Amino acid sequence: SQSIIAYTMSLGAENSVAYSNNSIAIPTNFTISVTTEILPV
Amino acid sequence: SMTKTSVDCTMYICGDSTECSNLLLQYGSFCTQLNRALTGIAVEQDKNTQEVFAQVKQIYKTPPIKDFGGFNFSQILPDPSKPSKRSFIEDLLFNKVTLADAGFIKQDLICAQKFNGLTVLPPLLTDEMIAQYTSALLAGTITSGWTFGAGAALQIPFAMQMAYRFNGIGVTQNVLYENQKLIANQFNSAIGKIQDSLSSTASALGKLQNVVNQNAQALNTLVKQLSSNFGAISSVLNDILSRLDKVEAEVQIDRLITGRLQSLQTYVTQQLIRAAEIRASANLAATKMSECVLGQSKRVDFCGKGYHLMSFPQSAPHGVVFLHVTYV
Amino acid sequence: ANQFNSAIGKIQDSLSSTASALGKLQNVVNQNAQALNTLVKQLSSNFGAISSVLNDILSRLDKVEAEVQIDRLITGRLQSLQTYVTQQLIRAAEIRASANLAATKMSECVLGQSKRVDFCGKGYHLMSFPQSAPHGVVFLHVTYVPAQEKNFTTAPAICHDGKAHFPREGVFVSNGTHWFVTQRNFYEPQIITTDNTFVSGNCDVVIGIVNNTVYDPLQPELDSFKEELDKYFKNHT
Amino acid sequence: DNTFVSGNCDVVIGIVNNTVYDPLQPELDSFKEELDKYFKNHT
Ligand SMILES: *[C@@H]1O[C@H](CO)[C@@H](O[C@@H]2O[C@H](CO)[C@@H](O[C@H]3O[C@H](CO)[C@@H](O)[C@H](O)[C@@H]3O)[C@H](O)[C@H]2NC(C)=O)[C@H](O)[C@H]1NC(C)=O
Ligand SMILES: *[C@@H]1O[C@H](CO)[C@@H](O[C@@H]2O[C@H](CO)[C@@H](O[C@H]3O[C@H](CO)[C@@H](O)[C@H](O)[C@@H]3O)[C@H](O)[C@H]2NC(C)=O)[C@H](O)[C@H]1NC(C)=O
Ligand SMILES: *[C@@H]1O[C@H](CO)[C@@H](O[C@@H]2O[C@H](CO)[C@@H](O[C@H]3O[C@H](CO)[C@@H](O)[C@H](O)[C@@H]3O)[C@H](O)[C@H]2NC(C)=O)[C@H](O)[C@H]1NC(C)=O
Ligand SMILES: *[C@@H]1O[C@H](CO)[C@@H](O[C@@H]2O[C@H](CO)[C@@H](O[C@H]3O[C@H](CO)[C@@H](O)[C@H](O)[C@@H]3O)[C@H](O)[C@H]2NC(C)=O)[C@H](O)[C@H]1NC(C)=O
Ligand SMILES: *[C@@H]1O[C@H](CO)[C@@H](O[C@@H]2O[C@H](CO)[C@@H](O[C@H]3O[C@H](CO)[C@@H](O)[C@H](O)[C@@H]3O)[C@H](O)[C@H]2NC(C)=O)[C@H](O)[C@H]1NC(C)=O
Ligand SMILES: *[C@@H]1O[C@H](CO[C@@H]2O[C@@H](C)[C@@H](O)[C@@H](O)[C@@H]2O)[C@@H](O[C@@H]2O[C@H](CO)[C@@H](O)[C@H](O)[C@H]2NC(C)=O)[C@H](O)[C@H]1NC(C)=O
Ligand SMILES: *[C@@H]1O[C@H](CO)[C@@H](O)[C@H](O)[C@H]1NC(C)=O
Ligand SMILES: *[C@@H]1O[C@H](CO)[C@@H](O)[C@H](O)[C@H]1NC(C)=O
Ligand SMILES: *[C@@H]1O[C@H](CO)[C@@H](O)[C@H](O)[C@H]1NC(C)=O
Ligand SMILES: *[C@@H]1O[C@H](CO)[C@@H](O)[C@H](O)[C@H]1NC(C)=O
């Protein structure tokens, strides 16, 4: 059932930011994340 | 970025002759090596456009209620009336740069170039997609400040974000709230002066027009070298083959092959050296996207002549414009 | 510490699982090998000489004919080196850019902490650890990422006693019924006080100011001392 | 003035016991000895 598809790419997930003139979002918690980055030297 | 170009080294050197193509094979992998180099440049133009614009994994959108505390972004935000969602200031930039050969279906200078085996490839990201990424970066800025760069987009009122900015330049946040109606009028008037400037002068986009001009000039120089004899009795391959039998024709055709091949090796060398300049400029533009749009920079004169508050990206043909907002 | 230890665990799992993670280094090794192979393959080419093998030309022809064939091999061969060295000079400029970037990330992410957004990984930068790799460097960037947000109602200022108050550091928030200062990057609410805030101007000029009490930590000291003062008078009657 | 407070002592690994000076307190007490001298004279 596998085949090659072709499609217009999506740029990302859709996301409305819930803006209002007196609303703020503040993080109650955090994640410490470790991410590799690789450079030719 | 710059225009993606590829060349059929056989159609350029030997265009539609079998008896020239058998001599071109005696030069080994040189045609493949040129094709590779031009492909490496062409893939790098998407790498660059992706590193500059695709700095968000979510496409944010501005709310329907534009209560930004008196600041007026309607000349840098999208315009739903236009058949692409380009903003008012971006659709000035798309008029100022006078493009050439976008490779969108052929069916003139452009027709002369293509008919000699010089094809121009599409970019991966069309001008709608760059406008959407630019809209998302701007919507993240005017609703969430820097935080959509660091992690989740966290809403904040725009006047309170401007206060956090002011604190970032050692001006106490009450200096914003006590002057907010003035600070908004100054910002709105300064955005007005950008539209007037771009409507008035042609030279403002010279850094982008020079890239489009060098791509066109380098393609034209490579077409003009089809006119040259290189010491053969004619510059036209079919005439040599019409007038001479095989053992004399091979001596003339080899002069055209040798001269043409040097003409491609020159073009591909110039284009590799331009690709490294555009490559640098794209790494700078990606760094200004990350440090001036997704953040606020303490780096003096990196995000405009002043103390940096925030910057807004705008797409341009083969480029990016930053509207840097600075406290002076 | 448990989050850091688990995130370092995920790096070992990632590197054990995928091949494509080191593509930026394998592409350099591949281009060096491909450029060397292309330069060897151009020894096979005739360039229009009666053979690509130099000894055959010299075996079959005497000097004045051999010179005409050998010059075609020399000319083609030279152009093959001038091509290789040009490609390698242009690659050397790319690797040198990348090395100047890696040296800058060593200085600003390992020897320091960077305020440069997204320079030392996707997050707020804490620290980075260098690791060597064949022809390269890996940085393990450690970043604080804010994780579980709540909405709050907010205000630019509090109006207490004809005067407008602003946070010294942090932001004002309310859960709906009560108002607090919190630091901007982690929810830790504190009672609004003359220690948490500073004053500027009357309440009339700030768009969106809200009325709330502003605590003074000198006042219940002064009043608990006023009830001690009253007890001294009342006993001494 | 040099420090700020958060939580009780139980959660911080490696906390140490030491006095924490309050510069309001010897003012309030030097004022309590002025206050006592006013009472003691007015006896
Ligand atoms: C902040 O986010 C932390 C995760 O990054 C979170 O830690 C997690 O806490 C929950 C409990 O609240 C743990 O869930 C497990 O709890 C016990 C076993 O210990 C079981 O009864 C449950 O079924 C479940 O398995 C998570 O395992 C734990 N994760 C880690 C890495 O410690 C914090 O609790 C969050 N803190 C706040 C204040 O929101
Ligand atoms: C945000 O800034 C916008 C750009 O200045 C502004 O749009 C402008 O609005 C005025 C007022 O309507 C327009 O002025 C024209 O209005 C009608 C047009 O038919 C005429 O009767 C008037 O004589 C006058 O020509 C501007 O033309 C218009 N500009 C654009 C580009 O649309 C918004 O109104 C501002 N928004 C807020 C909330 O302040
Ligand atoms: C907004 O945050 C407020 C502070 O946390 C919170 O008010 C506090 O609510 C608790 C109960 O959850 C009260 O606790 C007292 O409740 C009775 C009082 O007679 C006693 O049984 C308890 O021992 C205790 O004394 C706090 O006193 C109260 N704090 C204040 C300053 O009033 C609100 O409930 C939160 N509002 C929302 C909408 O979540
Ligand atoms: C925040 O707190 C302020 C102080 O309590 C409050 O100001 C007060 O507002 C009322 C209503 O406007 C005024 O009431 C008087 O208004 C006029 C005379 O000025 C008369 O017509 C009325 O009958 C009535 O006497 C108070 O005088 C006024 N006080 C001060 C010092 O300004 C704000 O309205 C509060 N705002 C919010 C959003 O809570
Ligand atoms: C830092 O100062 C703390 C306050 O003085 C001190 O806590 C005190 O520790 C002792 C010894 O554990 C406790 O003594 C009592 O312990 C149990 C009952 O809880 C009884 O079996 C004992 O006989 C004795 O009565 C104190 O009650 C305890 N006080 C408090 C408020 O916790 C810390 O131990 C000191 N730590 C250091 C490192 O100096
Ligand atoms: C923060 O709140 C927004 C919406 O505002 C709230 O709307 C009321 C229902 C009430 O909760 C008020 O206190 C607020 O004013 C949230 O956005 C909504 O998210 C849900 C999915 O979770 C979605 O179905 C809705 O359509 C969204 N509405 C809008 C206008 O965007 C937002 O998710 C809240 N933040 C968090 C962390 O939950
Ligand atoms: C916020 O917006 C509402 C309308 O949604 C308006 O009534 C209110 O006055 C605004 N407040 C501020 C401080 O701008
Ligand atoms: C009341 O005053 C007397 C001196 O007249 C003093 O000895 C006593 O300790 C005082 N008691 C209290 C509760 O103040
Ligand atoms: C520090 O290390 C010693 C052992 O050398 C240990 O006894 C002590 O509990 C440790 N203290 C802290 C705060 O980690
Ligand atoms: C003592 O009280 C009297 C008033 O009764 C006053 O004149 C005098 O200055 C006071 N002296 C001291 C030392 O308080």
Author numbering:
A (entry chain B): 689 to 729
B (entry chain A): 730 to 836, 848 to 1068
C (entry chain B): 924 to 1160
D (entry chain C): 1118 to 1160
Task: Show the paper's wording.
SARS-CoV-2 is an enveloped, positive-stranded RNA virus that enters a host cell by fusing its lipid bilayer with the target cell membrane. The fusion reaction is facilitated by the virus-encoded trimeric spike (S) protein after it binds to the host angiotensin converting enzyme 2 (ACE2). S1 contains four domains: NTD (N-terminal domain), RBD (receptor-binding domain), and two CTDs (C-terminal domains), protecting the central helical bundle structure of the prefusion S2. The RBD can adopt either a ‘down’ conformation for a receptor-inaccessible state, or an ‘up’ conformation for a receptor-accessible state; movement of the RBD allows the virus to protect the critical receptor-binding site from host immune responses.
The Delta variant (also known as lineage B.1.617.2) was first detected in India and was quickly characterized as a VOC and has since outcompeted other variants to become a globally dominant strain within several months. The Delta spike protein fused membranes more efficiently at low levels of the cellular receptor ACE2, and its pseudotyped viruses infected target cells substantially more rapidly than all other variants tested, possibly at least partly accounting for its heightened transmissibility. SDS-PAGE analysis showed that the Delta trimer peak primarily contained the cleaved S1-S2 complex with a cleavage level very similar to that of the G614 and Beta S proteins, indicating that P681R has little effect on the furin cleavage. 3D classification gave three distinct classes each for both the Delta and Kappa trimers, representing one closed prefusion conformation and two one-RBD-up conformations, respectively. For the Delta and Kappa variants, the FPPR and 630 loop configurations are largely consistent with the distribution in the G614 trimer; all are structured in the RBD-down conformation, whereas only one FPPR and 630-loop pair is ordered in the one-RBD-up conformations. The furin cleavage site (residues 682 to 685) at the S1-S2 boundary, including the P681R substitution, was not visible in these maps. There are no major structural rearrangements in the Delta RBD with two mutations, L452R and T478K. Neither binding nor neutralization of the Delta variant by most anti-RBD antibodies tested here have changed, suggesting that the two residues are also not in any major neutralizing epitopes. No obvious structural alterations were observed from the D950N substitution in HR1 (heptad repeat 1) of S2, with multiple pairs of charged residues in the vicinity that could stabilize the packing between S2 protomers in the prefusion conformation.
